[PDB]
Paper text:
With their low catalytic over-potential, [FeFe]-hydrogenases represent excellent models for a regenerative and likewise economically feasible H2 production. Theoretical studies suggest that the most probable PT pathway comprises of strictly conserved residues E282, S319, E279, and C299 (from surface to H-cluster, numbering corresponds to CpI), including two protein-bound water molecules (Wat826, Wat1120 4XDC19, chain B) located between E279 and C29915,16,20. In this study, site-directed mutagenesis (SDM) is used to investigate the PT pathway of two [FeFe]-hydrogenases, namely CpI and HydA1, which represent the largest (M3) and smallest (M1) type of monomeric [FeFe]-hydrogenases, respectively.
Crystallization of HydA1 exclusively succeeded for apo-protein, which carries the [4Fe]H-cluster but lacks the [2Fe]H-site. Variants of HydA1 apo-protein were crystallized in space group P32 2 1, with a single chain in the asymmetric unit. However, comparisons of crystal structures of CpI apo- and holo-protein with apo-HydA1 demonstrated that a lack of cofactor does not affect the configuration of the putative PT pathway. In E282A, two water molecules occupy the space of the missing carboxylic acid group (chain B, Wat717 and Wat974). The pH-activity profile of E144AHydA1 was quite similar to wild-type HydA1, despite a flattening out of the local maximum at around pH 8. The latter suggests that this local activity maximum is depending on the presence of the surface-exposed Glu residue.
Author numbering: 65 to 155, 161 to 351, 363 to 490
The structure:
Amino acid sequence: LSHVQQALAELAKPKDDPTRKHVCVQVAPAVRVAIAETLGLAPGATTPKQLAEGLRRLGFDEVFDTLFGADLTIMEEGSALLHRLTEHLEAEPLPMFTSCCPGWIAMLEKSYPDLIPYVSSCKSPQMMLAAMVKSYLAEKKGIAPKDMVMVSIMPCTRKQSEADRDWFCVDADPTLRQLDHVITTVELGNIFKERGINLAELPEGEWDNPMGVGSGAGVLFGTTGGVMEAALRTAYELFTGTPLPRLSLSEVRGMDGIKETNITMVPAPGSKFEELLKHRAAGPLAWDGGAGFTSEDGRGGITLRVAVANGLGNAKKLITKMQAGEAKYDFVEIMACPAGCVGGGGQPRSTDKAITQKRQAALYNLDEKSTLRRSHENPSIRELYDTYLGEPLGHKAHELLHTHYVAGGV
Ligand code: SF4
Ligand SMILES: [Cl-]
């Protein structure tokens, strides 16, 4: 039985059935914008809450926004970056690579195992949310993890292999998956139509909060610009005490699918970061000790060099020049898909050459695009850490939200 068939089997069970399980679903933003195309409509032609209603009509007991998991990734990865930056100032290496794309993680383990220490140990947004629901939420609702089923709807054909990583399980039992089944945008679209469900004709439903209390998806109003940018912002604003605006990446000449930006950071006055810049300034990626600037009275500062690679072919050319020292970066994100997740392998096929641009544009409302969201300000995220996880990068956070990598692959 395919994973789609297994999830549908769990849903086919009446809710009052003695063997019925608590079936949960989480949905990626890339899915929500592209799902309307399965009806022959434009991207974004169906609202988020219409999809929520549709999923609830399939029989899901919980409907979650993957963005909640993304806030956890931003928290952990932002802290991780700040940590590595900190220990490199006072003399887990640099540059740091992000790790949300399983296509990158796969290529990392098979072709570049010597780069493993440089990669963030953060789990993906979907896996963090999954680990959370079968731990915190299970305990809150008095449900055994074995009686909870976690489904994700993804734009990606690789998110199942990510989920199937052996140790992504509960209490060292690899049969108790943190995330059981992954369904693609087109597969979900096919399920709706085969049941006569038209999303565009549905009323607005509502999301569930992974914290098990309150209303909404447990995510505040506004946008972050994605995990990488928000992780950067997290580190930046703690380091400088000043807000980081939305990033504008510029294309690197001579390199396809590579974008970059330079971010200058002056430590906040009186901070530990100001002490470290002052009191001390004298592998496969040996890293030049950083890009720093200073001046007359000692306005000491460091320049964070960031790169983004789409996709895997273009990424190899970047790594080559990095090892050659021709490309110098501190923070690198590698996505397997040329257009990123909005153009993932699980997305509808279109004749429109600009379909990925339409998807991106329709991702959020002009209202939401104008408002900056910060993960550490999310009351649900604050509560989860204060009352359950402890500190980011800590013991509990490492066990539930972090992972490891295997040289040679799995
Ligand atoms: S870039 Fe492609 S392969 Fe990587 S996470 Fe996004 S959809 Fe999946
Ligand atoms: Cl994810």
